[PDB]
Point group: C7
Chain length 278, copies 7
């Protein structure tokens, strides 16, 4: 049992998309920010030295807030979406690997004892019965899926509001005279200043909105545990004479058991003997 999966293929694909997409998007944004140098460009008057114009540029930059906090918010979303599979790996993944290995070894040994009893002449059902009123593995799994859905939906709201905000007149006017400089007339009353990275942020927001809308049906589908395709694996094993709608973790354990019947070597033989019996 080297290759025991312990994660649904759909869930594994969803997590990678939801985490590895904002990481490459902010890697692109940060590379663009180190090529372009600055994120704003103001039109300082002609009688300004370099340092005064740099003051005007950094003053009108540090004075909406959505645009300036774009890569920090996307990296926060990437980290908060990496968090649930860390929670599942530390809390419920080692308590499931031993149960899967026990049920698989039990099924193999029952098949071999039945073959040795046929050619020379119920523990797993009672152990599945124990996992019928526990609600211990379905809770953590639901928490992992609901936290992923909430973070994805909130990031989708923010990336929709960003396109609804910076769709026109991205430039803005800015005042300089705050404090001591409120007396001299050498300084202009209003400078015209342009945000210079908002052109690529709408592309990086449309991509991260379209993919995040295409993800969410799979999270909603993965939260519906007992309405999936279940109970195909024991019907194969009822050939041996020695041998699902509620949300307890018997359903989830049956999903994790049908997900890897590759390790069961007896399953192929019993599927063949089922195909003869039809």
């Amino acid at each position: 049992y080297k290759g025991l999966r312990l994660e649904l293929a759909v869930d594994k694909l969803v997590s990678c998309i939801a985490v590895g997409l904002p990481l490459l998007l902010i890697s692109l944004a940060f590379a663009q920010e180190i090529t372009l140098g600055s994120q704003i460009s103001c039109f300082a008057p002609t009688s300004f030295s370099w340092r005064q114009a740099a003051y005007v540029d950094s003053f009108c930059w540090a004075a909406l807030w959505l645009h300036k906090f774009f890569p920090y918010i996307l990296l926060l979303v990437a980290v908060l979406l990496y968090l649930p599979n860390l929670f599942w790996r530390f809390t419920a993944a080692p308590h499931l690997s031993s149960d899967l290995k026990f049920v698989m070894e039990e099924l193999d040994k029952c098949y071999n004892r039945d073959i040795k009893d046929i050619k020379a002449a119920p523990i797993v059902e009672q152990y599945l019965k124990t996992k019928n009123n526990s609600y211990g593995l379905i809770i953590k799994y639901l928490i992992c899926r609901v936290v992923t859905l909430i973070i994805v939906f909130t990031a989708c709201i923010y990336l929709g509001y960003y396109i609804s905000l910076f769709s026109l007149t991205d430039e803005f006017t800015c005042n300089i005279r705050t404090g001591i400089l409120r007396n001299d007339t050498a300084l202009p009353p209003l400078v015209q200043c342009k945000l210079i990275a908002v052109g690529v942020f709408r592309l990086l927001s449309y991509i991260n909105l379209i993919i995040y809308v295409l993800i969410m049906p799979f999270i909603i589908y993965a939260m519906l545990v007992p309405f999936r395709k279940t109970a195909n694996v024991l019907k194969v094993y009822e050939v041996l004479p020695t041998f699902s709608k509620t949300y307890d973790d018997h359903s989830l354990f049956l999903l994790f058991l049908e997900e890897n019947v590759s390790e069961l070597k007896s399953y192929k033989f019993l599927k063949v003997l089922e195909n003869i019996k039809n």
Copy 2:
């Protein structure tokens, strides 16, 4: 069975070309962009300080959209083309390795039992019969090939339209007076400004168009599963007395079985004994 392939050689070659080519092309483009510094150069008038001319350059840059979004689009195509083999690896690759190992071990054991029965004096056919009305492995495989073909064809359309666009007069005129600056006559009415990286983007688009046109016949050929060269491997094994035009996954499993008969040690002996029998 250490070296079990689980990927067709043509498919493995196609994926690497379609993914590793835009990565090196945008690595070249990004290295060029950090050497040249900027992507535009405007002709500001003589009475402009450095900061005003920098404002003119970054204003006429952030004001078609195809040219400015070239490396982001090519990296998006590279990531979206890496996505299908991730889908195949997580979803259908471990369900195929166990089937290949079962059929190979079954064939070796049948050969050894027949040799021990000849020198001292049908499970695989019924298991291939089970994979005759399933349509489970051909669906995911077709999805992986159709998604690759669609992304390659859309990138080919975009890279054809880019050469059909920026083929002449890459420079353009640009206005500065938007907003407060619409009154003074010290600013020029129109500045002449040049896009400076469009010379190498036509080379990086001709290469990425020619290779992407040469790829697509192999994807179209790989989507034709039952019209390939099949059913050469059981005709070798019919020497032992104990022992394809539709799109079910028996055809695909036979392709994946003829692709690695290197691991079958009995295959060489039976091919030799076939060559004696001709």
Copy 3:
């Protein structure tokens, strides 16, 4: 016994959050500081060369102290929060792995001897009795949890005081004439100067305050050792005929024993036989 955990899942999750969050926050802050170059911008008068204005900027920068020492304080908090699990790993983690391996091997051997005695026809209780008046493992564990709680609470106080400080008028006035320059009138009496990174530090402080408030209930809960859910594992083993409110390390060892009963192969069989007996 390859996968012996030696750390509670809650404690492992808390440490990673409390350490890996300030590291990414100051990585963002340092990347922002190398893009923006400087952390202050003063308005030097027009008759100043570059070097005199740079002197004004670096003089008014090196002349509150909370703002200038933000990333050093957050990295100090990250290192001081990595320190307790280093203390636990070097001091008390190898003295616990051998005890866990001894009790697990003892339980497996007692189960096998009882099965061989039933089918062919108290050392662990006395060893748990030895760990009843020691107070050796609960002390180091409490020190690890109290040090984590104190560092998290002090960082929460500092990050609350930072938002209570830099909430308005982040710019400030600064005098230049100290020393020889206290005579000439060419220098201005007061320059207006702006702190330019205080806009993103309030975001990086609100995030690091909200997460650090959400952590602390789990540290308070983990410090309550005998009020957790204990003593579920020996009640399974009382089926064999051969076989908690105070703060000694019998309680902590029982927590570390119920945390990994995955390695006990006899536990599943005895749980099944308990389910038959109910």
Copy 4:
């Protein structure tokens, strides 16, 4: 059989030279381009600010094409020359390792059976006979060699044409007035501008031409499969009583078999007994 080669020594040496030489040449060129900063230097008139002269320099740079596209073409040649051994490794290398291991194990077992039959008192010939009318391994091998020869010859043509082009008057004149600037007389009619990296590109082209001319006889020699030195290995094995001019893959398999007779332990003994028999 750990050290099974599956590549001819000459072919392995040729590929490394043809791939690792343009990589170090363009690594040198890129390091030179980041030290020197720019690739052109124009002589702007005295009344030009920095930004106007930078516009003149980047305008006359982005306005032959051979010189500007030198490192991209050399990296394309390096990647296209790495491609054929990837094709050989994915497509025909695992189908050859099993055949080599089968023939080597068969020869060792025949030698041991003959020694046990002499001291106590034809499968490989029929398997070599099967690989006599196949043409399956010679095709892929020829494609790998012809693609390498074509890419090397085209790169040699380009690097010969580059020295035949930029051998004299590397500087050039350039016009600035295109578009709006075609009216004022303040701009000069023609600027004199110099290409500054063409001095080292002739060295990097003479090296990459001389080595690529010295490679090509070995590729032409490696394409002549049946005219090499063959059939020395079975004449050693005809001592045991139990036991080439056309382009089928029996010749190529004999080349790959004489290339590693180090793994055959019986070969040394039979060579010694041949030396006694002469």
Copy 5:
């Protein structure tokens, strides 16, 4: 005996604190020095070009010495504190691992022989007696601890003197006219110049002083070898019938033996049988 420690937990913790703290402190200082660029800022007069002002800045910088040599001194302290555990690892650590493995194997074999003699019906004391008048392992251990204490105390003196020095008027005046420039009156008699990194060096000195004062009691405690808690391990083993105030290395070997009785499997059984006997 894979996990044999050969280092006291307190000593291992102390070394990491004393070495890994100045490394991160000077990593912060060097990152700050590459962001700020320079370490001094002088006020050059208005008639100075850039190069003359740069000369003034680098002249008044290269003309106390404590401040300029801060990161080199802290890295020297970090390297000199890494040196003693290298000395202990190369010189006395392999001569101790074999002795620990011999005594542990001897104790296990004596326990097993006594159990086989009880159920079917003094070498270690004489080997501990040999290590009673040697003084070979206590010398190197004392040298490692005294060198660590001396380096920590000298670094504490230097970091106390640095705060006692740069506590007020960090700026200073500087003369320029040395040599040929001692005649013209265009140069000023004294420039006012500011040290710009002394604000963060007092923080990096207060941290590195407080932690280094908190370390030193543990080094003083670790140098007191025979006044620790010893001789608890043979009193467990006196149950079998076949079986400390001076500074010889019997005391140190007993410390290193009580530090890992986790590897002794007989120790748990004998501790249980001691608990029955009380």
Copy 6:
């Protein structure tokens, strides 16, 4: 036979010196070139802007050739000196490891058979006889040594000519008026310009000349194969009753056999019994 050397110690030392010395020398040169920025400094007249002076500097730089192509030539020498051990490793090293392992196993088995025949009561000579008229391993070895000697001698000629060239008046005059600029008198007739990295290149050439002269006697000595100290190993083995001036590869194989008689365990016993017999 894990530690089989397959390279003479002298040859291994020579290759590392001849390859790793120019790599560190050009690493130093490249680090110096990125600190100093440029490799030339011209004295442009006072009425030149920055861009015109930069044109003068890059024009007089790109207009002897020995100095400008120094690091490319030294890296070419380093790569061409790494090439021969790659040739030896791919072509003749696996054909020698099997022969060494055969002769060593044969000698061990003959010693054990002779000891079992003495205590209870010629294949290697005939295999050394086979390697007496082959000339197959001495050819490749000679090619590896002659190519190393030729590259080292040519690099020594070039590094001698460089010191014979740039020993005095490293500065030079340079003309600017080529082409359109040959009419105006505002440009100077000749500028004085200095090569600024020639001071450290004479140090990096004296080091790389002295070490390369000290290497060459060892290459000349290694090319003299039959005049080394040979035939000491069979005289030890003539104790058992069952058991060099020309340039065939029997001499080279005897050198490679006396180079590792550490793996022969029988050699020590037979050397002892030889010392008794003297």
Copy 7:
């Protein structure tokens, strides 16, 4: 015999100090040189543009030689001090590991044969006798120690002469008019120019002089082979009835044998039985 040392602890410590100290010193020097940018600062007159002053700075820099070649000389010393342990590892270290393993296995087998002969009722001396007139291992060892001592003493001479040189008036005057510029009076006759990195080089020379003086007594002590503490190991083994002032390699082999008697398991038993016999 996994942990066979093959290097004296003193020698291993000395090599690391002598090699890893100049590497960190020049890493500090290079980091300082990339922060400060340049290594000289000249006082150009006021009528000089940037490029003319840069010419003055790079001209007076490239016109003593000790100061400019400091990091290259220290890296040369570090590489030349890494060279002797490479020589010892390639040439004499594998010829010693086999001898140590032979003598250790011989001693263990003699002890076991004597114990089996006592409880049931001279090869190593003659092999030590063979290594009594060889002088083969003492020569290479002496060469490794004398080369280390010579390089350390020459670096100590150079670092003493550097402090004896740059102890006062580190600034210097420099003339500019060489060549064409020897006629105009606009250029000054002498500029005053300052070396700006000589302040930290005296610290990096005092450290590297004090440590290199403290090393040299250990190299002088390690060169005295027969005057060390020898011949303690055979006096332990004379208990079994079946069983140094000159510079042959019997003395050196006895040093390398007493250095690792940890691998001899019989040594502890025989030391115990010696302690009984006293």
